[PDB]
């Protein structure tokens, strides 16, 4: 396509994450209690950026347990699925 000379491949780190895995980020001792205890006001929060995952993709389905995610980039369906399970997304840069 159109060229931009000395292109340096760091704009394009976009490690994807599907909605499937998404509790391996959480350690087990937290994971089971937060697998139960599906209230609001203990909303287990997730830093995909800290785990090294840039953008969310949706392949999977998730329980209705509400969980908060931090990311930059999302797809529409994945966000809608989150809203259905009662978790919310908050965009960090």
């Amino acid at each position: 396509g159109m060229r931009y000379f000395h292109k340096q491949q760091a704009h394009f780190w976009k490690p994807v994450l599907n909605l499937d895995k998404l509790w391996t980020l959480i350690p087990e001792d937290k994971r089971d209690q937060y697998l139960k205890s599906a209230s609001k006001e203990t909303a287990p929060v997730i830093d995909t950026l800290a785990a090294g995952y840039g953008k969310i993709l949706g392949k999977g389905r998730i329980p209705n347990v509400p969980v908060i995610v931090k990311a930059r980039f999302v797809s529409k369906l994945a966000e809608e699925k989150i809203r259905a399970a009662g978790g919310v997304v908050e965009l960090i840069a």
Binding site: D20, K21, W23, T24, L35, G60, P63
Partner: protein, 134 residues
């Protein structure tokens, strides 16, 4: 039609000695199939995920049979629930092993299987996929 496998894992060879015993004697089809399966190579003994076990358990009239995978067993992070079953294979990943015991079920080796169900009784076999390879 092969005679004896390519490795020298001694324990597997003892196991195969046993299954030769059964497929010589009893004439079930079951022992033949697992023995033939053990002679395969590693690609052709693919790994089977516990989600696939759960789909097979979700069969009609299938909750109380024992599943068999011949090969190696994986964990799968995707399912969250899992039933409480009696499961047999050669090699168990620890995550999946503990997943099963967390469900409450039992994980066994094939000597223990052959103790319990020699003839292939109340049993069924799975096999993982192969078409993911080019």
């Amino acid at each position: 039609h092969r005679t004896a496998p390519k490795s020298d894992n001694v324990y597997l060879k003892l196991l195969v000695k046993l299954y030769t015993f059964l497929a010589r004697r009893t004439d079930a089809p079951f022992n033949k199939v697992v023995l033939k399966a053990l002679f395969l190579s590693k690609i052709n003994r693919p790994p089977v995920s516990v989600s696939r076990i759960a789909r097979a358990l979700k069969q009609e009239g299938a909750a109380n049979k024992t599943v068999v995978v011949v090969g190696t067993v994986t964990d799968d992070a995707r399912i969250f629930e899992f039933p409480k079953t009696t499961v047999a294979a050669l090699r168990f990943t620890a995550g999946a092993r503990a997943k099963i015991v967390k469900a409450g079920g039992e994980c066994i080796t094939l000597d223990q299987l052959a103790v319990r169900a020699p003839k292939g009784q109340n049993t069924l076999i799975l096999r993982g996929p192969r078409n993911s390879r080019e």
